[PDB]
Amino acid sequence: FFSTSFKYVLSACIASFIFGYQVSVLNTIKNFIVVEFECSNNTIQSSFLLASVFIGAVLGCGFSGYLVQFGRRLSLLIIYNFFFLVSILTSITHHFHTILFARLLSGFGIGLVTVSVPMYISEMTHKDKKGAYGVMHQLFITFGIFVAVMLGLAMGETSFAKLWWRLMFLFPSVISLIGILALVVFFKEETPYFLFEKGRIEESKNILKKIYETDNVDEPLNAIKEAVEQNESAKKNSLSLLSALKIPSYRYVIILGCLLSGLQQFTGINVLVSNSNELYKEFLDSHLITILSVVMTAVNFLMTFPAIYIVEKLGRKTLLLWGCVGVLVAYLPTAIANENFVKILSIVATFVMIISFAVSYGPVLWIYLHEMFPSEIKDSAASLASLVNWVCAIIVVFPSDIIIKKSPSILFIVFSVMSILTFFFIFFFIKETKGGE
Ligand SMILES: OC[C@H]1O[C@H](O)[C@H](O)[C@@H](O)[C@@H]1O
Numbered sequence: 001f002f003s004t005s006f007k008y009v010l011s012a013c014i015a016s017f018i019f020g021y022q023v024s025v026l027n028t029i030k031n032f033i034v035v036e037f038e039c040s041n042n043t044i045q046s047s048f049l050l051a052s053v054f055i056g057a058v059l060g061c062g063f064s065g066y067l068v069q070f071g072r073r074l075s076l077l078i079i080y081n082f083f084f085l086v087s088i089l090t091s092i093t094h095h096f097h098t099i100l101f102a103r104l105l106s107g108f109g110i111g112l113v114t115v116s117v118p119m120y121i122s123e124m125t126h127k128d129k130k131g132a133y134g135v136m137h138q139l140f141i142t143f144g145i146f147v148a149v150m151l152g153l154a155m156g157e158t159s160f161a162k163l164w165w166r167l168m169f170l171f172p173s174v175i176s177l178i179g180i181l182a183l184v185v186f187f188k189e190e191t192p193y194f195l196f197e198k199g200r201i202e203e204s205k206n207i208l209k210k211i212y213e214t215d216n217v218d219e220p221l222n223a224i225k226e227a228v229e230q231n232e233s234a235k236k237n238s239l240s241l242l243s244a245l246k247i248p249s250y251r252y253v254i255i256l257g258c259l260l261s262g263l264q265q266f267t268g269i270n271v272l273v274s275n276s277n278e279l280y281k282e283f284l285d286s287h288l289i290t291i292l293s294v295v296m297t298a299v300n301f302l303m304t305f306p307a308i309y310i311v312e313k314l315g316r317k318t319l320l321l322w323g324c325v326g327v328l329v330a331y332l333p334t335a336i337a338n339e340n341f342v343k344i345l346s347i348v349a350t351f352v353m354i355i356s357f358a359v360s361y362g363p364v365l366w367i368y369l370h371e372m373f374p375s376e377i378k379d380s381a382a383s384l385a386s387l388v389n390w391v392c393a394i395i396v397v398f399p400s401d402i403i404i405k406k407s408p409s410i411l412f413i414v415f416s417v418m419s420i421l422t423f424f425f426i427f428f429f430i431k432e433t434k435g436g437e
Contacts, residue, residue, distance in 0.1 A: 002213045005125055009133045011186040012076055012120040013140040014179035018083050018172045019113040020144020022106045023053070024297075025172075026099075027274055028152035029165040036162075037096055045096050047398075050274055052100050053107035054397070057390035060111015065383035068116060071197065072123065073190035075116045080180040083109045087173030091166050114366070114386045119379065122370035123191035124211060126220070127435030131311035134367030139304045142358060145273065146297035153290055192221070196228040196376075227437040231376040239376060253373050256429055257385040263425065264365045265392035266418045267327060269357055271400045272296070279404065296354055303358035310359070316368045317432035323360025324423035327353055331419055335412030365389070371433040 026033070026049070034042050068075045086109055090102040118137050125133040151171065155164045192207045194200065204224070208217040240246075244254035272279070276293040284292065311319060330352035334345045366386075373381045403411045 001129075002211070004213065005129065005211045006133065006136075008124055008186055008211070009121050009136050011179070011182050012117050013136050014175060014182060015076055015079050015083075015113050015117050016137045016140035017144040017147070018079070018175055018179070019110050019117075020141040021148045021172050021175070022083070022110055022144075023141075024145045024148045024273060024276070025152070025168055026103060027276065028149055028293075029155075029168060030277070032155075032161065032165045033093065033099065036093070047401075049096065049100050049103060051394060051398070052104040053110065054390055054393045056104045056107025056109075057111035057114065057393070058387055060108040060113075061115050061383060061387035061390050062111070063108070064112040064115035064386075065380060067112065068119060068379050068383070069197075071190045071194055072116060072120045073187060073194075075112070076120055077180070077183055077187055079109055079112050079116060080176045080183065082112075084173045084176035084180065087170055087176065091170040091173075093166060093169070111387075111390060114389065115383045118366045118370050118386075119382060120191060122367070123193040124207070126212065127223075127437075128312065130371070130435060131316065131367050132308045134370070135304065135308045135311055135363045137366050138358075138363035139301075139308070142297070142301040142304045142362075146294075146301045149276075149294050149297045153294060156290060192224050193227075195224055196231045223437060227374065230374070234376040241380060244377070244381065250377065253377075254381050254384070257369065257372050257381055258388045259425070260430060261365060261369060261385040262388040262392040263418070263422050264361055264389055265396040266415075266422070267357060267361060268331075268353070268396065268400065268415055269362070270393050270397050271404075272354070274397055275401060278401075292350060296350060299351055300354050300358045303355050304363060307359045307363045311364065311367070312434065315432045315434055316364055316371070317426060317430055319360050319364050320368075320426045320430060321423060323356050323364070324419055324426065326356025326360065328416060328419045328423075330356065331412050332416040335409060335416055338412075339409050368430075368433065371436065372431075374437055 030046060034046075037045075064075065067078065082105070086102060086105045090099065090106060093099055118134060121134045121137060122130060148168075151168055152165070155161050189203070189207055189210075192204045195204045205217060205221055208220050209215060244250045276296065277289055280289045280292055307319070314322075330349055334342075334349045337345050369385050370378070370382050372385075400411065403414075
């Protein structure tokens with residue numbers, strides 16, 4: 001291996017770290033902002049504010065199609081400028097209105113990352129290393145979440161606090177300023193799949209010529225030529241944004257693609273992300289909440305590492321099924337228990353689900369998505385599938401908190417039904433991809 005392939009992956013992964021940090025920055029220092037702003041109406045406003053990121057990420061995943069059409073060059077570059085300017089706005093805080101709009105674009109930006117970065121990795125790494133390098137995207141999403149917790153709880157236990165949580169929202173602007181200037185050493189080249197948009201064939205050759213340092217790249221460029229000629233034809237055919245529902249041959253991929261992306265949220269990951277400091281308040285103290293959460297995100301970040309190597313060994317379908325097994329062992333034993341014995345099962349729920357998610361479904365989705373739909377439909381369908389993920393985030397998180405307050409037994413039971421449904425969905429429909437186009 002030649003680390004120049006990984007070099008371009010890490011440069012795009014700065015945007016994955018800005019996503020993960022934006023997701024949980026406000027979710028940790030939420031209580032601090034309440035002090036200035038105004039429980040009660042704050043609980044309602046805070047839920048509205050949480051939604052703006054999910055509603056914005058839907059619109060981000062939507063736009064990162066019209067945007068990616070101009071290249072993953074501008075697509076990534078633009079996020080770093082945007083996120084630097086959103087971080088400047090989020091940091092200037094006064095009232096809910098300002099921070100709702102600011103955290104709506106922190107969601108629009110986040111959306112772009114979910115489509116743009118996995119596509120960049122998928123479109124520059126070798127067929128055989130595609131999965132592990134795509135796993136990097138999640139490895140920095142998870143790292144972004146944990147960093148936010150360690151940075152925030154650093155102030156935990158004020159005048160030198162009001163000038164700190166402000167400095168926390170501003171942190172991703174410096175990271176974006178790093179990433180933007182870092183894509184001056186890297187972003188003088190765009191992924192070889194740009195052969196279809198621009199006939200810069202010699203430039204396309206010189207991309208793979210540096211990636212693996214092989215001067216004769218007749219193998220992947222003639223493989224890209226066959227994938228580009230399939231696109232060149234479809235444009236003359238005029239295959240619409242849809243045509244998936246119109247053509248049964250294309251419906252089986254768009255529907256299964258959207259279904260798998262949506263089923264990621266029907267696991268209960270973002271219930272533990274957005275309500276880390278809230279869901280544990282039911283019994284556990286404020287001193288305990290901060291510990292069980294800082295350990296959780298550290299575990300979540302650490303568990304993404306084993307996925308790097310086992311995504312090419314087992315594959316994508318083999319890993320997906322194992323994640324659905326571990327989630328049944330995390331949900332069903334806790335579901336019947338609540339119809340010292342259940343206090344132990346609380347820690348089992350805390351980590352068994354986190355452990356099985358970060359190594360299995362978490363990264364696999366964002367890499368399996370850019371491995372499906374081998375033709376022009378690729379970028380197109382990969383944007384709408386990732387949008388369903390952010391649509392489902394609203395569909396899962398919102399009712400989950402309502403149902404946790406009324407009956408937790410029914411909640412863990414419905415999540416175990418989905419844990420059975422997803423396993424048998426992957427086993428019956430989901431393909432296995434280890435190298436293609
Ligand atoms: O690690 C947690 C994260 O995993 C994935 O990236 C999901 O898409 C995201 O919604 C979740 O917050």
